[PDB]
Amino acid sequence: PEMVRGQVFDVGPRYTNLSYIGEGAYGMVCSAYDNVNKVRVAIKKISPFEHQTYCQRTLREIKILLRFRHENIIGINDIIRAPTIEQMKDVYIVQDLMETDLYKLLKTQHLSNDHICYFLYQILRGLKYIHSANVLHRDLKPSNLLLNTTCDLKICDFGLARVADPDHDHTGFLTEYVATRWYRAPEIMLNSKGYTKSIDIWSVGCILAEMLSNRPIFPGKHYLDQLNHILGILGSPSQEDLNCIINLKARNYLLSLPHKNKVPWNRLFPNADSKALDLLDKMLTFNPHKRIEVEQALAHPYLEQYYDPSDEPIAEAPFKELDDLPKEKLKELIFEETARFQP
Ligand SMILES: O=C(N[C@H](CO)c1ccccc1)c1cc(-c2[nH]ncc2-c2cccc(C(F)(F)F)c2)c[nH]1
Numbered sequence: 001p002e003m004v005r006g007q008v009f010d011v012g013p014r015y016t017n018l019s020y021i022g023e024g025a026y027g028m029v030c031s032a033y034d035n036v037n038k039v040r041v042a043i044k045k046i047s048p049f050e051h052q053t054y055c056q057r058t059l060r061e062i063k064i065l066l067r068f069r070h071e072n073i074i075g076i077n078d079i080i081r082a083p084t085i086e087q088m089k090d091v092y093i094v095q096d097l098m099e100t101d102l103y104k105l106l107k108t109q110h111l112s113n114d115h116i117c118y119f120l121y122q123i124l125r126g127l128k129y130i131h132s133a134n135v136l137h138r139d140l141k142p143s144n145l146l147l148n149t150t151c152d153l154k155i156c157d158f159g160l161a162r163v164a165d166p167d168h169d170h171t172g173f174l175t176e177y178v179a180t181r182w183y184r185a186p187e188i189m190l191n192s193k194g195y196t197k198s199i200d201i202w203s204v205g206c207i208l209a210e211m212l213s214n215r216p217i218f219p220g221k222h223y224l225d226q227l228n229h230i231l232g233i234l235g236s237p238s239q240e241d242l243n244c245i246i247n248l249k250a251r252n253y254l255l256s257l258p259h260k261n262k263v264p265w266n267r268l269f270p271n272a273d274s275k276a277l278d279l280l281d282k283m284l285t286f287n288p289h290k291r292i293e294v295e296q297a298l299a300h301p302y303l304e305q306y307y308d309p310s311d312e313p314i315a316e317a318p319f320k321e322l323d324d325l326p327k328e329k330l331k332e333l334i335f336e337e338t339a340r341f342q343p
Contacts, residue, residue: 004030011043011080011092018043026054026159031097034077041077042097047090048334055330056322057159058091062337064135064158067319072126074146074156079341088335095156099149102142102207106214113273115151116211120279121298121306122153123204128294130155131197132314134164138194140203141183142210163320165195173249174224181226182206182216186234187288189227190250198288201297205283212269212276217284234286235262241287275302 001010004020007028011018015032022029027046034041048054065076080092102119105111111119123145130137137144139160146154160179171193177184179194185202188194209217217233220226231237236259245251265277279302282292292300298307322330 004028007045008090009043009045011094014078015041015043015080015094026057034094040097042095043080044093044095045090046093049089049327049331052327052330055327055334056325059322059330059334059337060161061158062093062334064161064319066337066340068129068133068315070126070129070313072122072153072155073129074154079338081335081338083342085331085335088331091334091338096146096154097148098146098152098154100147102145102147102153102211104143105147106142106210110214111211113276116208116276117273117303117305118151119145119147119153119211120204120208120276121303123155123207124294124297124303125312126153126155127200127204128298128312129315130161131164131200131294134318134320136162136164136195136197137200137203138162139179139183140200140207141180142207145207162195164197165193169193169195170247173247173253177223181220181223182218184220184226185288186227186230186286189224190254191245191247192288196288197293198291201283201291201294202288204297205280208276208280208283209269212272212280217268230286231257231260233263233268234284235260237286241290244287244289273302275300278302 001008002012002018003009004018009018009030011032014035016035017033019031021031021042027044029042029044031040032043046058048058062076065074069075074095076093076095078094082088137155137158139157144155144157146156169192171191173190177188177194183203183206185192185199206217218226218229220229236257237254242251242254265280269277279297279300283297285291298312
């Protein structure tokens with residue numbers, strides 16, 4: 001078998017001439033030549049069966065991405081694994097090959113206003129399809145946005161994705177959360193489980209602000225520091241927005257803070273387009289009920305050059321209990337979900 005960075009990467013005979021792209025705690029990514037379609041693809045090696053969390057993330061992604069088909073969403077072209085559950089240790093997911101991710105781009109490249117506009121359009125176009133399927137991504141950030149050499153954008157990593165559940169979204173103050181800290185909506189730290197569509201719109205708002213300055217807008221160093229970064233810019237929530245927070249611990253925490261005025265967007269981003277800042281304000285709205293939705297965001301004057309609701313497709317059907325399932329049972333479901341790719 002072929003070896004990459006002192007690790008086994010057996011994807012043959014169909015996929016050859018491997019090249020290391022990057023790594024993650026939940027898998028290794030390589031580029032490879034597809035001998036059937038005569039095109040280079042991306043291959044992600046995952047080894048999840050010893051950890052329940054790893055198994056859950058693997059299954060969520062495989063189930064969702066096999067059901068999804070959209071230009072701004074990474075696809076699953078093929079899945080490589082052993083012919084039996086007993087012999088299956090690693091799973092190789094074959095996906096679209098892209099040049100880079102938005103995290104890598106923002107470290108060294110200044111984006112033109114036209115690039116910010118086009119990237120944001122593609123993010124929201126992909127997000128419209130995800131939300132129309134009653135799915136939440138829940139981990140939108142620049143590293144989960146892939147770009148090819150012609151600036152085509154694809155949303156990836158559906159490991160933390162869930163079916164929207166607005167009726168069961170309420171929770172206590174400072175409830176533990178898994179998704180990336182800097183892109184977490186304020187209500188996560190106050191009274192939300194992150195089971196509504198508004199959670200993804202906040203992350204997109206954070207991504208827009210980061211595209212405008214090449215710096216994360218709310219770089220919290222720990223759980224509660226994240227909320228103070230958000231409030232440091234948005235200012236003290238209004239009486240109406242506070243009255244929407246019924247939980248006493250969360251409400252009294254906000255009430256205990258000295259009054260803070262809103263830092264204007266034009267002071268943080270003096271070179272930014274005024275229409276981009278108006279849309280930013282609407283995505284980075286404190287109250288999740290008042291926060292702009294994905295279809296409104298697409299119809300905003302900032303995206304007028306691209307907006308076409310007839311060319312912004314939705315899922316053919318909505319998508320629809322993996323948290324309380326043993327890793328041995330999750331392995332069985334992963335085997336069953338990947339069966340269609342076996343010869
Ligand atoms: O699934 C992909 N990315 C996620 C994280 O977002 C992931 C999860 C766990 C471990 C590794 C990766 C994924 C990326 C790609 C991809 N295709 N073409 C290029 C890339 C790419 C680009 C930049 C960085 C990386 C990565 F993930 F290796 F760091 C991969 C395909 N699938």
